[model samples]
Target: TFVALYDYESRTETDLSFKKGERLQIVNNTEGDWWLAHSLTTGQTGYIPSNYVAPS
Candidate 1:
């Protein structure tokens, strides 16, 4: 679990929209530019930039 530290709008179909302060569940913290996360509000899994999140 983590919290978004910055607002990120999806640029691609697989990217997830993340707003600052939103709680997110980490599905897979892949070592790369992105990571898999599940949105508690939207109830969907999508890719998010790892740098945009902080420890919850």
Candidate 2:
């Protein structure tokens, strides 16, 4: 599993999180779509409709 970070303010993403470059693991319970996991802090997850998130 690999981890990535999101900069919602600037609409950017990094492989490291804000806290001391900590990386977040990306997990998918079932193999279907790329956007389905609930964000641990955000509390909302599932295909964000593409316009919200873009690949880096």
Candidate 3:
């Protein structure tokens, strides 16, 4: 589990919206300066800057 922070904002995922304790899995993908998957839903994967997420 992790906490969502402001640093996760991006062009595609500009709104850093997330539910409290939202489960996020770190995938082996990357695009630019963000990870390829960080959304709450699987098909909704998007860039989440590393600084915005903290391990729980």
Candidate 4:
């Protein structure tokens, strides 16, 4: 599992919004910086920056 340190805003409607300290499950990391992540609280998924999240 991974956690967020701060909120991350997305430019697409399909993107999911994350709150500070939000918890997410690992979907996949096909890219170097962006990873498809699943938000456990809202049950939403989106590709977010790996830099915005930290291993928990």
Q: Best candidate per TM-score, number?
A: 1
Give the worst 10-residue stretch by lDDT in candidate 3: 7-16
| Candidate 4 Cα outliers beyond 4 Å, as residue runs | 30-32, 41-43
Which candidate should be chosen as best, given lDDT against the real structure? Answer: 1
Give me the runs in candidate 3 sitting further than 4 Å from their true place.
Answer: 13-23, 29-33, 38-42
Write the residue-wise lDDT of candidate 3 on 1-56 in tens digits. Answer: 55555544355445344544556665543443555445546556655555666556
Give candidate 3's error at residue 22 in angstroms.
4.5
Tell me how many residue pairs clash in candidate 1: 0
Judged by lDDT relative to the true structure, which candidate is superior, 3 or 4? 4
Q: Against the unseen true structure, what C-alpha lDDT does each candidate score? A: 0.79, 0.33, 0.53, 0.75
Give me the runs in candidate 1 sitting further than 4 Å from their true place: none
Model 2 poorest ten-residue lDDT run? 14-23
lDDT of 3 at 7: 40
Residue pairs with colliding backbones in model 2 are: 3-24
lDDT of 4 by residue, 2-56 (tens): 8876698888977676777776786876545878787667577788777777777
Q: Give the better candidate number (2 or 4) by lDDT.
A: 4
Clashes of each: 0, 1, 0, 0
